[PDB]
DNA sequence: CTGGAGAATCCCGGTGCCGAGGCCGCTCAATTGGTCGTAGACAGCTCTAGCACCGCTTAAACGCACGTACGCGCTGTCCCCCGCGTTTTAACCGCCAAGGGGATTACTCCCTAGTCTCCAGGCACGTGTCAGATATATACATCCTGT
DNA sequence: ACAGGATGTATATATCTGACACGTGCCTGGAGACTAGGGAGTAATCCCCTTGGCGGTTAAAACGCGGGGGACAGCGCGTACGTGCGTTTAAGCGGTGCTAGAGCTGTCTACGACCAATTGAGCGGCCTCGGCACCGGGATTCTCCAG
């Protein structure tokens, strides 16, 4: 299927392009579930950190918007503790023309430029916004949790 | 002198009144015509102005989508001629009949 | 001196959120209200039916899920669906 | 009475045009005329059944509202 | 001198009125009881369909070149767009007026 | 490289299935009808590109 | 020497037996299975009672007779006693489906 | 399932149009017939199936139909 | 010991129940608060209605040499009554069948 | 063990002060319900709206005579409008 | 595949000016400057589908 | 157009069977009797708006003559639908079996109605200016007759 | 097919104007906090009924063939409908006047909701026999081809 075939196209380009402090792959078995993991990018509190995510696709992808989950703990006024994020692109902006690759860019992209206009945590929003070094320590606790 | 061939005006005043969103009919003899209708349910009713003049739209819509049918009959008998028989035919389809 | 309502404020602000360089006439104000009014009443109405089918005496966000897919159209259905599961969710999560 | 013949042939005439006719026989004049007071009658009659139970004595555009409503005939613009 | 007050339509960040909405279920008799999710989510359907027609009526009346919508914008872009035809096809718009349509039988050749 | 390009030219960016043959009154952007038809089925009277708002009627089709 | 109607007579003597019986008229097992193979495209493994399966049949004949009614009256004004598939393109535009 | 919409056959379209009072019958009308029964179908089974799926339940019920019927302004007696 | 419980069928000398049709009245959510009258006027249209159903139905099936209405028989009376037909136009009678009635144009001559 | 209530007892009652000697089958009282429920609803649902447009919280049998009126068609409305009238004046004075 | 290209990407009438203006009577698309030259010299009718174009029915094409 | 032949329909008689009709717990829903708060009937007042009339302008309706385009009838062809007989298929019926899921009951807890206080968003009322309607002179597109 | 004349028709310019977009005062309906109770979510159990399968009968479906009836194209003719022009005719607008009646407020009383106790009417279960569907056989009628 056109679905499937896109998937493979997409894991040629996370496997062979992998854009810098991100990846992903697809399950040999299943091209339709992901699991990622993102080194976090440079000038953040979340830099270097080993946030892992799992993606699961359908065969709407690039047609409806898909879910993507992180396997680790989430604390940002944009993304929801349950390792959900409040980002049009996979929630009100779907694109076809979106690839995993630019998806992970978007990313890392917002952990440097987070978007609070979208508040998901808003005990995150208010640290990050109010806070600076109360969001700093926590966000560097969460790292570290990241890394163990 | 000038003289259109029959047809010419016809398709003018389609494409005429296809554009405009004016009423058709004139005012006064509708409301003479709806109080006389209404006169045997009821004697000296009062009328709202508003309320003959949703009267009147309904009417209209109503007429236009009736015309519109019985065009569409008058084409499927091979014609270009309205006539009673189309009507006859559309409001027995449309389940007035 | 009676105040009478309408959806005339939320209308206009919509209009300058889709439109921001756009007017619009008294008279289609009416026909947005009447719209506004007529769809309200249709939603309202099947979510009432529905709950009375299933025995229950509480219009939850369900049931306004159900009514939406019953009453409108194809992919009208689709996004207006994820537009009440996404006020849904923002609603409850702030 | 008499006031159905104030239902012209031209007024006929250019509600057909609307509807996007090209040509009229000479005997719909006396059809149209009699469908729409069939029409009429029919939703008057709700509208002066409404006015009654609300005790008026005037027909209102809310009563004409909604004696079409109850036709499946929903008009925008009157309230 | 409890809190300063937010409206629910913006918690939940749309423009039509929930608190409103809210009241008008339950003064309508449709049910004994009323969720709390059951307005939020109403107003954001009414919300939506609000927003398509209004821009199709935007799209239409620039089409025109006119800056403000009149009930033939509206009519246009309701019977234009074919999910909305069939949402409102027992609708009459007043001062709507008709599509520009002539079957092709009737055009000359 | 530059075949690529050409590539990414002469092919909807979207479907990367069909060459350009159908472009925006509006914003000046090309695709293919399919592409196009299909983003209006969606509703999403979008740019791919710009975002600006558009209709099908600001859709024409273009020849090479 | 064979025995044959002329073409009508049979076809009118079976319009008067089908308008005075109440049966169904679709086989009941084919029907089952179309209705299984569409609800197929919203729901799996959906079960069906017998009685909505025939609640859903009996909408369906008196639906298409109904059609059939008005494509007989599309046809016969049209001035013709053979229903053509133009005839329900007609009746179906009319009563507001097409 | 698949191709089941040819169980709908030639004679059984020729008995319904018979029973509708038709004479004469074109080669043409019984694609047509399964196209519009299929479109019916279509319509009624998907208000059905919500009714089932809004109540949690996974075996679509007369009721259900019935409702269906209901919605699109053709009531059924003889079934609850 | 108060007194002989008399229904309220029975004093307005009805056959339909008064009392269910209140209690249907009142958790149907149709109104916050229903009179007393209101219940005996539903339940008195609605023996009228069933009351011409049946007789038109027993006219049809006496008419068929049968002593018992089949489906076919309301079908009958709903569709040769006038008023009946135009009441229930829109309603689908299972193992009803149609009237037998066949075009001027398609039979012989 | 649910218990599920009809109108079977008083059609059938119906059925014997009409037709004295005649029988009904179980598919046609199905029918008979069906028919019954539906008109219930139909009044009901007009009474309803009836009282709603008019700024009431009751349901009299005015309202009830109106929505007959509206419902019922010619002379069916008007021997229905006496049977009512005449009920509900037996039962206020017995 | 490549001259091909160079014939898609530049205009037919100039086969040096890339193709940037739409026509909005055939469709076809060209450059500017061999536009503007038909109009100038009477020459608005099309290249290709000979139809009849001014400077209103000029639409241009971005890539 | 007027008679036989044959097929279909109709009419009558005998037989079984299962579904309509009657009957008995009994349980819950209808009935009876007070009590109370509020919904609606009633009376009075206000002032909006609906009805009636008159005069002038003039846009539209009406009436007539002409001609041509279209509705309608007739004729011929051929193809496609129908009636029929034979073979093939699978619908239908009866029986058996396993289990998924509809239909209850208990329990608890969390969600929503109800109430009181507060205040800000939305409604009623002014007000000015700009989008849009209108008049006029165009250049431009379209129909029609002669070529 | 082609060109020029005459008639609508789109376009640009200039001017009025009143309706819309905005601003302001105020009030009442939404929000916040709390309390209490029952609606429903969840878990467990029971057994009805949905699904799956197998085999035999046979009724309906499918296929083929011969032919004739109707669909459709073509052609001629005559009515009647479109077009245009001149002559009513009455619609439309404005202005004025009068008053019925819609709309609101304030009282107050009958009336429906609520609650507790009581009993009888209808529902589920359970028999039973006759209306009726079916099979067998004879009588009548409708269609069709030959006369
Ligand atoms: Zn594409
Ligand atoms: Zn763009
Ligand atoms: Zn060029
Ligand atoms: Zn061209």
């Not at chain 1, 091209?31 to 990018?41: F, L, Q, R, S």
């Not at chain 2, 003959?52 to 009959?73: H, I, K, R, S, W």
């Not at chain 3, 009676?2 to 439109?19: D, F, N």
Request: charged share 25%.
């Amino acid at each position: 299927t056109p679905a499937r075939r896109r998937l493979m196209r997409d894991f040629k380009r996370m496997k062979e392009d992998a854009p810098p402090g991100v990846s992903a792959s697809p399950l040999p078995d299943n091209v339709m579930v992901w699991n990622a993991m993102i080194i976090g990018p440079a000038d953040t509190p979340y830099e270097d950190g080993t946030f892992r995510l799992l993606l699961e696709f359908d065969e709407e992808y690039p047609n409806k918007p898909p879910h993507v989950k992180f396997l680790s703990e989430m604390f940002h006024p944009n993304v929801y503790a349950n390792g959900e994020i409040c980002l049009d692109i996979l929630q009100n902006r779907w694109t076809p023309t979106y690839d995993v690759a630019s998806i992970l860019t978007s990313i890392q992209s917002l952990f440097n430029d987070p978007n609070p206009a979208s508040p998901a945590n808003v005990e995150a929003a208010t640290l990050f916004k109010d806070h600076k070094s109360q969001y700093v320590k926590r966000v560097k606790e969460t790292v570290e949790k990241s890394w163990e | 002198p000038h003289r259109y061939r029959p047809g010419t005006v016809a398709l003018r005043e389609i494409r005429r009144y296809q554009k405009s969103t004016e009423l058709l009919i004139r005012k006064l003899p509708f409301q003479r015509l709806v109080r006389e209708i209404a006169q045997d349910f009821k004697t000296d009713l009062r009328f709202q102005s508003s309320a003959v003049m949703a009267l009147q739209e309904a009417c209209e819509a109503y007429l236009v989508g009736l015309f519109e049918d019985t065009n569409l009959c008058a084409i499927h008998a091979k014609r270009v001629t309205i006539m009673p028989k189309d009507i006859q035919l559309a409001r027995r389809i449309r389940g007035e009949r | 001196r009676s105040r009478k309502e309408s959806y005339s404020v939320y209308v206009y602000k919509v209009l300058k959120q889709v439109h921001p360089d756009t007017g619009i006439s008294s008279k289609a104000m009416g026909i947005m209200n009447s719209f506004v009014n007529d769809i309200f009443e249709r939603i309202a109405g099947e979510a009432s039916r529905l709950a009375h089918y299933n025995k229950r005496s509480t219009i939850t966000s369900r049931e306004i899920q159900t009514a939406v897919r019953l009453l409108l159209p194809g992919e009208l259905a689709k996004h207006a669906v994820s537009e009440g599961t996404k006020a849904v969710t923002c609603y409850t999560s702030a | 009475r008499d006031n159905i013949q104030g239902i012209t042939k031209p007024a006929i005439r250019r509600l057909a045009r609307r509807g996007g006719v090209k040509r009229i026989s000479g005997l719909i004049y006396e059809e149209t005329r009699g469908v729409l007071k069939v029409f009429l009658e029919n939703v008057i009659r709700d509208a002066v059944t409404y006015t009654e139970h609300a005790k008026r004595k005037t027909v209102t555009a809310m009563d004409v509202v909604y004696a079409l409503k109850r036709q499946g005939r929903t008009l925008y613009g009157f309230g | 001198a409890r809190a300063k007050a937010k409206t629910r339509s913006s918690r939940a960040g749309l423009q039509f009125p929930v608190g409103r909405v809210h009241r008008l279920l339950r003064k309508g008799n449709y049910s004994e009881r009323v969720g709390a999710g059951a307005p939020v989510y109403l107003a954001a359907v009414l919300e939506y369909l609000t927003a398509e027609i209004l821009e199709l009526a935007g799209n239409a009346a620039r089409d025109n070149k006119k800056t403000r919508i009149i009930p033939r914008h509206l009519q246009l872009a309701i019977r234009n767009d074919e999910e909305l035809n069939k949402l409102l096809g027992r609708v009459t718009i007043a001062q709507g007026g008709v599509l520009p349509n002539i079957q092709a039988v009737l055009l000359p050749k | 490289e530059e075949l690529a390009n050409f590539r990414t030219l002469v092919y909807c960016s979207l479907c990367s299935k069909n060459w350009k043959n159908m472009a925006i009154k509006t914003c000046g952007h090309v695709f293919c009808e399919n592409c196009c038809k299909e983003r209006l089925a969606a509703r999403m009277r979008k740019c791919p590109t710009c975002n600006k708002a558009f209709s099908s009627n600001d859709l024409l089709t273009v020849h090479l």
